[PDB]
Amino acid sequence: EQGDIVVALYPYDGIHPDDLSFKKGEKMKVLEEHGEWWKAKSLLTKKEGFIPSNYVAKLNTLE
């Protein structure tokens, strides 16, 4: 859901300006879920952009 903290499982290089580029282990805040791609904010760079949702996992997976 919106505001959840996620961690990158694999790195990803954005191909377009609206994408975030991240490394494995990078922490991001999910802003909006839009199917396969989510809008997120890198907690390291504070930059926002779309990320492939299959490349991240919730830091909280139990609840």
Numbering used by the authors: 63 to 125
Give the original sentences from the paper that presented this experimental model.
Lyn kinase (Lck/Yes related novel protein tyrosine kinase) is a Src-family kinase organized into four domains. These include an N-terminal unique domain (also known as SH4 domain), two adapter domains (SH3 and SH2) and C-terminal kinase domain (also known as SH1 domain). SH2 and SH3 adapter domains regulate the interactions of Lyn kinase with substrates and may help confer substrate specificity.
The crystal structure of the Lyn SH3 domain contains five β-strands organized into two β-sheets. The largest differences in position involve the residues that are found within the polyproline binding cleft, G76, H78 and P79 of the RT loop and E98, E99 of n-src loop, which exhibit positional differences of 1.5 Å – 2.3 Å due to rotation of these loop elements. Conformational changes in these two loops are observed in the NMR structure bound to the herpesvirus-derived peptide. Flexibility of the RT and n-src loops has previously been suggested as important for interaction with polyproline motifs, which might proceed via an induced fit mechanism. Analysis of whole genomes revealed 18 cancer-associated point mutations within the Lyn SH3 domain, affecting ~30% of the residues in this domain. Evaluation of the locations of these mutations in the context of the structure suggests that many of the likely transformative substitutions could prevent the interaction of the SH3 domain with the kinase domain, but by distinct mechanisms. For example, a subset of the mutations, including D81N, W99L and E98K, may disrupt the protein-protein interaction interface with the kinase domain, and eliminate negative regulation of kinase activity.
